[PDB]
Amino acid sequence: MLEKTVPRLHRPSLQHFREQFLVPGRPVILKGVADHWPCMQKWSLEYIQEIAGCRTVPVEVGSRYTDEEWSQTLMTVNEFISKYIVNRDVGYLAQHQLFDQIPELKQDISIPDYCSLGDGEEEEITINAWFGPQGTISPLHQDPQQNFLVQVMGRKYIRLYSPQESGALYPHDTHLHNTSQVDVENPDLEKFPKFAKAPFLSCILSPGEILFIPVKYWHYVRALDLSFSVSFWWS
Ligand SMILES: O=C(O)CNC(=O)C(=O)O
Ligand SMILES: [Zn+2]
Ligand SMILES: [Zn+2]
């Protein structure tokens, strides 16, 4: 009823991606694109520690719903892995440009062909690593650019709402990057009534798959396993 699955397409043409997805601002999962990038066979937990273990990175801890509700700390990848993954409490190496810090890792990925349909130059695209244990929640929010979210390790549950459905999501609208006040998986419907009947797409995103999140399409993301994603912001 309220819930449909995000469509999946194998290697759709540039033209079809443009006409049926990019312009109308509709999400889709692309298959058979990021699928043989070397990172898919290579990036084990072990490999990441060997290559990146000693590098310092920002690690996020807390409810990213309000602003005071969270915090970042700078630590080595090795400290992150032992304190937040191997064995207790919740932390997330989120939204970090790891590939500018460690240029060798750039060899293991590619810029999706589909980005050339934008206006922007290729140098202008922002590439982020999202890396953390099962349970990482990134609350419902919009990004000001288009996104290809590429899953490498593990799976993620993602929920998506149209921008035309903003009213029913009760935005803070205290930031542009607007964020929602509703907990998609434990919402007080007394406090947020209109949300109940709001239509959405969802999916479970698996290794090799790419999620296209249109500019300003609302998204919520939860990691079902030990996870590593790579996002591409572009326009
Ligand atoms: O992957 C996550 O935890 C959240 N990611 C995003 O909101 C994104 O890539 O735009
Ligand atoms: Zn703020
Ligand atoms: Zn986002």
Side-chain angles (χ1 to χ4, degrees), residues 64 92 94-95 128 130 136-139 141-143 145 147-149 151 156 158 213 219-223 227 229-233:
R64 202 163 183 179
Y92 197 11
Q95 198 170 336
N128 277 297
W130 304 77
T136 69
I137 290 156
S138 300
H141 65 288
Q142 305 184 300
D143 299 307
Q145 286 181 291
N147 191 353
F148 286 128
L149 184 52
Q151 192 65 17
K156 267 167 171 173
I158 305 190
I213 311 187
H219 45 292
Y220 165 98
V221 181
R222 191 176 104 236
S227 186
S229 310
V230 166
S231 57
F232 294 77
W233 293 338

Side-chain angles (χ1 to χ4, degrees), residues 70-82 84-85 89-103 105 107-109:
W70 68 291
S71 188
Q72 271 176 319
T73 308
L74 201 61
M75 53 174 77
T76 75
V77 172
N78 281 334
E79 291 160 332
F80 170 71
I81 290 180
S82 50
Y84 293 116
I85 293 161
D89 217 321
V90 185
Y92 197 11
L93 192 182
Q95 198 170 336
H96 185 57
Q97 299 190 265
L98 195 61
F99 309 100
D100 287 39
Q101 191 174 17
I102 318 196
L105 293 172
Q107 305 177 359
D108 297 327
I109 63 195

